[PDB]
């Protein structure tokens, strides 16, 4: 009935009822926690005590059989006064110790818990808390049960009068947390059940890495691609480079981006307090609601980022105006000023730089200058991924292509010699290439990775001057044309994916 | 008579019933006077011809280091018509570990043409005087024919920065070295160290 929700209790039996108010992008997981178990387990290999002279910490080491005796017979040695504190060390009891008192004497070390049956009389078995390394001195199979270290002074000061009274142990205790992971809504709630819906992310780091993390969390959901006992990672952008080092502690609920190696660009959220790493760039932290990350092993988690991503590249000019004035940021115009002018470039382009500078320079483009392209992702997956990485469409909505070489009908674009690695021949032409086809030369040719397009058709050479076996088609230009013939070398043209 | 402490290697040897040393490993004898260079951790080089020389140097009162080369077998790639079988080489860290010693003792093998180019590549990066211990009699002039610095027979165009200070012949790989060879090595080290 009366259940506690987040911090503001609700009641609605079905999840839907309570999660109606709770912000949640559909598709993520639901974490419920039930409660705590608080299992008390104690083995006290190291035993405690409560003598009339204080409390020392004994610790069983030599199994022998004195340990087997102590196991439960230490409770029979409870409330036993110090019998003697002579050259034969401090002794206590003396209780019945049926352990076969083998005359065979043994060597013992300074402060070594010993259950030497004093006088070889079972019932006179003395708890001889050894003080000085006594050599062949006591009988018994082997009086050595453990070693005394903690509270050494206590057993030293301990006088005959003082007893061990409450021979303590270690009250060893543990904790278990119930967790169940869900993603149903029509279920009955019994009483006093706690539900968490989303986590809050606070971003504070270098601008490029933080922008990478924001682009990962632009939709509010974080995919769980890898999970361990210490972190969960997202692999949406695993081949994108960053060069920023932020090597501080990867504490509980820390967000990091791996900046080097096979997994450069992966976004990590840490569920355990770990040491700093040079290969991890911390981009922020998760402030409250960590348990949704803690108890989620796979799927989706709804993430809300405190600093909104201020990158308006796919929007109109009035949208940027109103969104940046609602954040109190001074604005100035550069290119197309029309309220519907499509923004192409913004200076600075990083959210952290914008917030620290409190000014944005927005560049618009003419409606007919924007180039419209369609990318074949199903036909040439690797080539399309490379094209998106090089043109920048993986992060923003408008990509930039730089003219590298030009001759009449051909216009070749610049390449990135960092993403052109697995450019296996993917979509090779079979017939004559038609006009307005974007293509990338594969690893077969010497100029692998160069992109180009031609405004005419030939039956022999691709849009980049290579034969068909050395060219894989990635996409085509759909709507806007007659701007590739009026762009000089080195100038940048801007593209928009229309699928 | 003084204390002698060896910084042992950090890597275990070759299995259970095999050699104790590991390839590409260095064992520092604290005070750096003589380094003994072994080509491989195998039975042809470890404990039969190398650790015997090592205990002779340690018995003479000179602290000893033993370095096992990572790639000590074969001929260098600058041998005529390239290398065959395996490629001999020296790492920069190995050269730096050798170069902090006052003297070097290196154990070579049988073929005369292999030893000269191996010593040339070794002394291209080692600048301390080294003693060559091999089995077949090589003269201390055939090293100068390919451009190796040498105490008695200098070359006109020296292609090495290190000097061969003594050639000792009659030590077979994988066999127990006699006391006379150890005495010759000790006398050479004492005459060319202090």
């Amino acid at each position: 009935m009366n259940v506690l929700v987040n911090n503001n209790p609700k009641s609605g039996k079905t999840l839907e009822d309570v999660i109606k108010d709770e912000y949640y992008i559909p598709g993520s997981n639901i974490v419920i926690i039930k409660g705590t178990a608080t299992v008390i387990k104690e083995e006290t290999k190291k035993y405690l005590i409560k003598t009339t002279k204080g409390s020392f910490v004994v610790g069983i080491t030599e199994e022998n059989e004195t340990v087997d005796f102590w196991n439960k017979n230490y409770k029979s040695f409870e409330d036993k006064s110090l019998i003697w504190k002579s050259i034969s060390d401090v002794s206590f009891g003396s209780i019945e110790i049926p352990l076969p008192v083998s005359s065979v004497k043994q060597n013992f070390k300074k402060w070594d818990v010993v259950l030497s049956v004093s006088g070889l009389d079972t019932s006179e078995g003395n708890l001889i808390f050894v003080q000085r390394d006594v050599l062949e001195l006591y009988g018994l199979e082997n009086p050595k049960i453990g070693i005394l270290i903690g509270g050494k002074r206590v057993l030293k000061t301990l006088t005959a009068d003082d007893r061990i009274i409450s021979i303590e142990q270690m009250r060893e205790s543990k904790e278990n947390i119930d967790y169940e992971i869900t993603t149903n809504l029509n279920k009955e709630i019994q009483d006093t059940w706690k539900i968490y819906t989303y986590c809050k992310a606070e971003f504070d780091g270098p601008p490029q890495s933080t922008e990478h993390a924001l682009a990962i969390l632009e939709n509010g959901t974080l995919e769980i691609s890898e999970n361990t006992n210490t972190y969960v990672a997202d692999c949406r952008l695993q081949t994108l480079f960053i060069d920023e080092e932020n090597p501080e502690d990867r504490d509980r609920g820390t967000i990091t981006v791996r900046n080097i190696g096979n997994g450069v660009g992966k976004v990590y959220i840490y569920q355990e307090s770990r040491a700093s790493s040079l290969s991890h760039t911390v981009v922020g932290k998760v402030t409250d609601g960590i348990e949704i990350v803690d108890f989620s092993n796979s799927g989706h988690i709804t993430v809300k980022t405190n600093p909104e991503r201020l990158s308006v590249i796919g929007k109109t000019q009035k949208d940027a105006k109103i969104l940046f004035e609602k954040h109190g940021i001074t604005l100035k115009m550069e290119g197309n000023i029309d309220e519907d002018a499509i923004i192409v470039e913004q200076v600075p382009e990083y959210t952290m730089d914008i917030l620290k500078s409190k000014e944005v320079t927005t560049k618009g483009i003419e409606p007919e200058k924007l180039l419209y392209v369609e990318i074949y992702d199903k036909d040439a997956p690797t080539t399309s991924w490379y094209f998106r990485k090089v043109t920048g469409l993986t992060t923003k909505r408008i990509g930039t292509l730089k003219i590298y070489f030009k001759h009449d009908d051909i216009s070749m674009f610049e390449r990135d010699w960092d993403y052109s690695k697995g450019l296996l021949p993917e979509n090779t032409p079979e017939k004559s290439i038609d006009s307005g086809i974007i293509a990338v030369t594969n690893m077969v040719k010497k100029y692998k990775g160069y992109i180009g397009v031609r405004t005419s058709s030939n039956d022999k050479y691709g849009p980049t001057g290579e034969t068909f076996e050395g060219t894989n088609i990635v996409g085509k230009v759909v709507k806007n044309s007659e701007i590739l013939k009026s762009v000089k070398q080195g100038e940048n043209i801007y593209i928009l994916e229309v699928n | 008579r003084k204390e002698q402490i060896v910084d042992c290697r950090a890597v275990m040897g070759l299995g259970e019933g095999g050699g104790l040393a590991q390839r590409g490993t260095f064992a520092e004898g604290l005070r750096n006077d003589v380094v003994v260079v072994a080509m491989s951790p195998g039975r042809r080089h470890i404990t039969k011809p190398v650790c015997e020389i090592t205990y002779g140097i340690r018995e003479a009162g000179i602290q000893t280091s033993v370095l096992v080369l990572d790639a000590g077998g074969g001929i260098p790639s600058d041998a005529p018509q390239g290398s065959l079988g395996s490629t001999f080489g020296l790492k920069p860290e190995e050269a730096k570990q050798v170069n902090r010693h006052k003297l070097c003792v290196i154990h070579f093998g049988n073929v005369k043409s292999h030893i000269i180019y191996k010593a040339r590549l070794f002394l291209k990066y080692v600048d301390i005087p080294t003693i060559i211990v091999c089995q077949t009699p090589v003269d201390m002039e055939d090293f100068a024919a390919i451009g190796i610095k040498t105490k008695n027979v200098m070359p006109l165009e020296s292609k090495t920065e290190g000097k061969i200070v003594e050639i000792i012949t009659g030590v077979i790989r994988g066999e127990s070295a006699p006391q006379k060879k150890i005495d010759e090595i000790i006398e050479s080290i004492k005459k060319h160290l202090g």
Binding site: - | I5, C8, G13, T47, E59
Partner: protein
């Protein structure tokens, strides 16, 4: 919490496994590539043991449980001559290395003889700078019985000797005397395993004693922090540039030129000089670090 084990796999895709270790918070203590296989001593958190085992079986690697890969051992041979050095002492040292420990050969100046034997104070303190000392003695009862004064240190001690049973007031492992062959017979391997068992028991007792009052910072992550801050640690030509001791470290730099740099290292929010005893080492004028506990 940081279990230390040895990984034996191949060099192919080993960098991806190193990245996984770095991602889960593990630290690579020692790395060695022979030809195509790599031996990797890694300290990983205890909650990732099964995940690392699944990762290692993905790359067809091998996990070897090494109980001694957090300590350093002094092996005290009487001399470095042909009698004790080229066999037994290296057999003991390599068997100690097989379970992860970092050994050091201590050759006494006057450790030979029955009544003319003596031990210097400098050699004594060098022995006390280690975590545990192993003495490689001879094969006569009266010789070792008249040689007890060599084993006079406040360090855990295991004495190896020729006779099966000795009446010294120290831990003794028999059937390991002075020999001239490599230890390969069954009795010799059994005696080596026995010595490993005794040193493992002593190390476990000392670990429990240290765990009664833990230090401020574990030595493994302190070594990791020192390698992260000090940039001259990659230029060390020593076998193990930083040796992880039981309750400290041994950094193999010159003490006079580097102690002010080592002490002024900020770990967490603490300076190192207030939390550790940075002192000159007897071994080649190195830097020895002894960690304080949480009581002080």
């Amino acid at each position: 919490m940081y279990q230390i084990i040895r990984y034996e796999g191949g060099v192919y895709k080993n960098n991806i496994l190193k990245e996984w270790i770095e991602d889960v918070g593990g630290f690579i203590i020692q790395e060695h590539v022979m030809q195509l296989d790599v031996y990797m001593t890694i300290a990983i958190p205890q909650n990732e043991i099964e995940n690392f085992k699944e990762e290692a079986k993905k790359y067809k690697g091998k996990i070897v449980e090494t109980p001694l890969a957090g300590i350093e051992i002094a092996i005290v041979s009487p001399s470095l001559s042909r009698h004790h050095l080229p066999h037994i002492a290296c057999d003991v040292s390599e068997y100690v290395r097989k379970f992860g420990a970092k050994p050091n050969m201590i050759g006494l100046a006057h450790g030979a003889g029955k009544n003319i034997s003596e031990i210097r104070e400098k050699e004594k303190r060098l022995i006390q700078e280690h975590d545990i000392a192993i003495y490689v003695m001879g094969n006569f009862e009266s010789c070792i019985l008249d040689k007890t004064h060599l084993f006079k240190v406040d360090i855990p001690l295991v004495v190896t000797g020729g006779p099966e049973t000795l009446d010294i007031p120290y831990t003794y492992v028999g059937n390991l005397g002075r020999r001239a062959q490599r230890l390969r017979k069954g009795e010799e391997i059994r005696a080596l395993r026995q010595m490993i068992d005794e040193v493992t028991k002593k190390i476990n007792d000392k670990r429990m004693e240290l765990s009664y009052d833990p230090p401020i910072i574990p030595p493994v992550v302190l070594k990791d922090e020192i390698e992260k801050r000090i940039d001259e640690v990659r230029g060390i030509l020593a076998p193990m540039p930083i040796v992880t001791q039981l309750d400290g470290l041994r950094i193999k730099m010159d003490y006079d030129r580097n102690h002010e740099e080592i002490e002024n290292v900020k770990i967490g929010k603490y300076l190192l000089k207030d939390i550790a005893y940075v002192t000159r080492s007897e071994m080649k004028n190195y830097i020895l670090i002894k960690l304080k506990s949480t009581s002080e």
